[PDB]
Amino acid sequence: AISIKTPEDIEKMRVAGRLAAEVLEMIEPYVKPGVSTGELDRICNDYIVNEQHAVSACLGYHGYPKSVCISINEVVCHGIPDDAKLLKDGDIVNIDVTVIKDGFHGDTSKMFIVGKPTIMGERLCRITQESLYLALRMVKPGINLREIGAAIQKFVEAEGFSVVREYCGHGIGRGFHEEPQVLHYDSRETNVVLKPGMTFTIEPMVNAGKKEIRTMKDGWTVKTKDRSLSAQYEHTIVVTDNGCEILTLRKDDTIPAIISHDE
Numbered sequence: 001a002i003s004i005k006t007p008e009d010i011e012k013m014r015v016a017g018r019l020a021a022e023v024l025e026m027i028e029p030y031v032k033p034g035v036s037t038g039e040l041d042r043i044c045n046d047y048i049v050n051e052q053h054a055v056s057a058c059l060g061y062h063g064y065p066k067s068v069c070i071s072i073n074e075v076v077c078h079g080i081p082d083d084a085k086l087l088k089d090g091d092i093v094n095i096d097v098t099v100i101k102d103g104f105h106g107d108t109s110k111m112f113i114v115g116k117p118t119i120m121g122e123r124l125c126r127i128t129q130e131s132l133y134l135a136l137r138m139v140k141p142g143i144n145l146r147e148i149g150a151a152i153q154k155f156v157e158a159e160g161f162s163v164v165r166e167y168c169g170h171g172i173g174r175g176f177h178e179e180p181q182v183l184h185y186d187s188r189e190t191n192v193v194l195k196p197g198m199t200f201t202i203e204p205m206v207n208a209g210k211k212e213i214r215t216m217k218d219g220w221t222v223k224t225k226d227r228s229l230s231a232q233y234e235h236t237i238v239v240t241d242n243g244c245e246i247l248t249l250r251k252d253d254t255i256p257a258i259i260s261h262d263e
């Protein structure tokens with residue numbers, strides 16, 4: 001039975017979502033050729049703890065050792081910040097930030113392209129963000145999550161890309177992952193009719209090549225099986241009476257925070 005957040009809960013999620021977005025805005029000037037992912041993670045954790053007075057939800061989660069996930073190129077998700085891993089020209093990099101503030105979580109991620117983009121990296125990132133945005137435009141009471149997942153998948157596949165099956169968006173609130181699962185592809189098992197006050201993420205992982213993935217022996221890092229590039233963007237939202245409100249919007253987003261479907 002899916003959680004419905006109160007107005008007071010939603011305001012706390014606005015606060016936490018803003019913090020998560022602000023980590024991404026803060027880190028941008030540091031994402032440059034030559035920086036290590038270990039350094040980026042320290043900058044993020046110091047900011048979260050010392051400036052935001054918040055906590056990373058990733059740190060210690062199932063034993064995860066770092067504060068943000070940083071995934072480069074063929075890494076799909078859960079990449080571990082490493083002092084030895086240096087960013088370089090052409091890399092596509094996801095930074096995924098989840099913070100807890102006043103008991104509530106905010107969860108967001110974006111791609112950064114380092115130095116001169118490669119055209120395929122830029123296209124993959126663009127299509128991935130566009131797939132998130134088309135899903136966000138669909139969210140309103142009465143729509144089924146199945147329709148949203150199906151639409152993401154059709155859009156991505158038409159570009160010759162694929163959707164990763166093993167990971168999904170999620171309800172979010174006092175818990176990091178709550179009901180429902182938010183699949184980014186069509187499934188007969190999905191039957192969730194949205195209601196005002198539901199809060200969840202949408203966070204498609206899109207591969208340039210085939211959909212299959214592999215987890216590395218570190219038990220964390222996930223890569224494309226074919227070593228094709230993979231990209232992801234994520235926002236946390238609340239369903240409103242006539243659409244949704246994005247809780248993790250950044251200045252560089254190009255979709256409005258409040259989406260209304262009323263006349």
Ligand SMILES: N=C1N=NC(N)=C1/N=N/c1cccc(C(F)(F)F)c1
Nearest residue numbers: 058061062064069078096097098107
């Ligand atoms: N950073 C995230 N944003 N949305 C998620 N589902 C995220 N997953 N995060 C993690 C972070 C560390 C470990 C794991 C785990 F699932 F592998 F345990 C998941």
Ligand SMILES: [Co+2]
Nearest residue numbers: 096107108234
């Ligand atoms: Co996330």
Ligand SMILES: [Co+2]
Nearest residue numbers: 107201203234
């Ligand atoms: Co998430």
Ligand code: NA
Nearest residue numbers: 072073075230
């Ligand atoms: Na990637």
